[PDB]
Design a protein around this ligand. Structure first.
Ligand SMILES: O=C1c2c(O)c(=O)ccn2N([C@@H]2c3ccccc3SCc3c2ccc(F)c3F)[C@@H]2COCCN12
Ligand SMILES: [Cl-]
Ligand SMILES: [Cl-]
Ligand SMILES: [Mn+2]
Ligand SMILES: [Mn+2]
Length: 183
């Protein structure tokens, strides 16, 4: 099985289209770069999972009514920048200098999501070298490890559902001799 075929079988059409659109903005070609398309699909999928299972009520109380998180990843950078900058103004906070992956309506922070094949901690601190504390960080590995800058933001159950998806994907890729494509 080829990577492109795996992608089309394991990811929703919306995610695939967005990740390709994004690679195009950077003029990376999805057909020449199937590992990048895979990685971008996973990252965007994780973002969507996080936003899909956190809601808030009229007062501001959590629940596993309105979405807790706005996904900024997956839009064209020009729109994404207008959206980041406008959310930040409308909540009276600093606009980060990097483009974020999510906005948390509860804590009023921008979130950077990271996916890694190494250890979650190594990728946490690397991200923090650039971002300082402009954003919260949510780092997931394919080795069942995580590294949140705020443990409450995401529930212990939810971290585990993202970790299991990743574990699912690594398993199938390995079964199909495609994991080596990513390493
Ligand atoms: O927003 C991201 C980004 C992240 O948010 C991230 O967590 C990791 C990596 N990123 N990068 C993603 C990306 C995202 C997920 C997995 C791998 C890659 S690999 C580089 C690349 C990305 C997107 C399109 C493209 F053509 C690329 F070459 C670029 C880094 O420059 C800001 C935009 N961006
Ligand atoms: Cl950026
Ligand atoms: Cl940089
Ligand atoms: Mn991003
Ligand atoms: Mn990210």
């Amino acid at each position: 099985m080829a990577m492109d075929t795996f992608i089309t079988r394991n990811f929703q059409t919306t995610i695939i289209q967005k990740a390709k659109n994004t690679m195009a903005e950077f003029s990376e070609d999805p057909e020449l770069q199937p590992a990048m398309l895979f990685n971008t699909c996973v990252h965007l999928e994780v973002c969507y999972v996080i936003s899909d299972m956190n809601f808030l009520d009229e007062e501001g109380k959590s629940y596993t009514l309105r979405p807790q998180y706005e996904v900024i990843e997956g839009m064209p950078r020009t729109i994404a920048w207008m959206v980041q900058r406008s959310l930040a103004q409308e909540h009276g906070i600093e606009t980060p200098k990097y483009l974020a992956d999510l906005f948390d309506y509860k804590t009023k922070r921008f979130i950077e999501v990271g996916i890694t094949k190494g250890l979650a901690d190594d990728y946490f601190w690397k991200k923090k070298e650039k971002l300082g504390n402009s954003m919260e960080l949510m780092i997931f590995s394919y080795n069942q490890d995580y590294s949140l800058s705020n443990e409450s933001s995401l529930d212990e159950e939810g971290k585990g559902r993202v970790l299991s998806r990743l574990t699912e994907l690594q398993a199938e890729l390995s079964l199909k001799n495609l994991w080596q494509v990513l390493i």
